[PDB]
Amino acid sequence: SDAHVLKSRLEWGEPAFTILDVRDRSTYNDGHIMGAMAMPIEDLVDRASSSLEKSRDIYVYGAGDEQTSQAVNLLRSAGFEHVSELKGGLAAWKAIGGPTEGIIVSRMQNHL
Amino acid sequence: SDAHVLKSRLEWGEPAFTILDVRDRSTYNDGHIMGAMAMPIEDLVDRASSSLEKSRDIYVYGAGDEQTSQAVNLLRSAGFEHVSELKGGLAAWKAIGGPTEGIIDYNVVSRMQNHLENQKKEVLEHHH
Ligand SMILES: [Mn+2]
Ligand SMILES: [Mn+2]
Numbered sequence: 001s002d003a004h005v006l007k008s009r010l011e012w013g014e015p016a017f018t019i020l021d022v023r024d025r026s027t028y029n030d031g032h033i034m035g036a037m038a039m040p041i042e043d044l045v046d047r048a049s050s051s052l053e054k055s056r057d058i059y060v061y062g063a064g065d066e067q068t069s070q071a072v073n074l075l076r077s078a079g080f081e082h083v084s085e086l087k088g089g090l091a092a093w094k095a096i097g098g099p100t101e102g103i104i105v106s107r108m109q110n111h112l
Numbered sequence: 113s114d115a116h117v118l119k120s121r122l123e124w125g126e127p128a129f130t131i132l133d134v135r136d137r138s139t140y141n142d143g144h145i146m147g148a149m150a151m152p153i154e155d156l157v158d159r160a161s162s163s164l165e166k167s168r169d170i171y172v173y174g175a176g177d178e179q180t181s182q183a184v185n186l187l188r189s190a191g192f193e194h195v196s197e198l199k200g201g202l203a204a205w206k207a208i209g210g211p212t213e214g215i216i217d218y219n220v221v222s223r224m225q226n227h228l229e230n231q232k233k234e235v236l237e238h239h240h
Contacts, residue, residue: 011223015231031216035228099221103146105211108122 001084003092006059010035017057019086020048022071024063029103033061033086033093038109041071045078054079061086061093113196115204118171122147129169130234131198132160134183136175137222141215145173145198145205148213149229150222153183157190163229165238166191173198173205 009017019036021028028038039047041062052058058075060083062068068085075083086093094100121129133140133148140150151159153174164170170187172195174180180197187195198205206212215221229235 010227011220013227015227034215034221034224097217097220099224100216101213102216103211103213104143105209108119108146108211111123112127 001059001086003086003088003096003098006033006086007093007096007098017059018052020044020058020060020071022060022062022067025106025109027063031090031100031102033090034099034101036061041067041074044071045074048075048080049078052080054081056080056082058083059086060084061089064089113171113199115198115200115208115210118145118198118205119208119210127233129171130164132156132170132172132183133202134172134174134179137218139175141221143202143212143214145202146211146213148173149232150225153179153186156183157186160187160192161190163235163238164192165234167193168234168238170195171198172196173201176201 006019019033020039021032021036022039022041022044025038025040058080060068060071060075062071068089072083072085118131131145131148132151133144134151134153134156137150137152144150170192172180172183172187174183180201184195184197
């Protein structure tokens with residue numbers, strides 16, 4: 001799906017969707033899409049299935065098209081019904097003016 | 113209270129609490145305590161009473177001591193039963209390893225931040 005759509009969802013849309021950053025944790029921390037949850041791909045299914053309803057609208061993005069498509073396949077094979085890639089990932093999001101948040105403590109995050 | 117207590121609630125406790133940054137919106141965006149909701153004093157009680165259950169454990173911090181205790185007292189006079197000041201604010205929080213969160217057109221971000229806040233577990237409890 002297109003970055004312009006997700007940006008609209010975040011500015012004006014119904015609350016019911018989640019953005020999943022599927023890259024490395026530290027990478028997420030250095031910078032991620034505003035609102036995205038850190039679900040590194042190594043434990044994506046386990047983590048998503050224990051935290052997200054299968055009917056929830058989910059947008060996924062990783063470091064590149066390959067990682068993103070892999071994350072998307074995983075979640076669906078796990079029973080998730082509304083998952084889509086975020087074409088262009090982070091880069092495409094910045095290009096259209098989308099905000100990026102960064103963290104500056106792994107125990108707070110895991111315990112979380 | 114002390115930033116040490118909050119650091120422990122996050123490292124070891126329950127997610128039975130909410131953190132409120134009562135400073136200027138731009139300052140918040142440049143850096144706030146991780147997980148903090150943006151609630152400028154100017155709009156604090158209106159935004160909180162319509163977003164949080166008054167029995168919710170709340171930690172508040174502003175620019176300095178005076179603004180912080182001013183915020184605490186406002187929420188309390190408004191009925192919030194478990195409000196605590198986060199003495200030392202952002203700086204006190206960093207001095208001890210507290211991780212920060214920062215944003216990187218003024219309306220766009222605020223519009224998004226509000227939608228993400230309304231989607232927070234506790235705000236959803238106050239609504240359900
Ligand atoms: Mn974030
Ligand atoms: Mn002001």
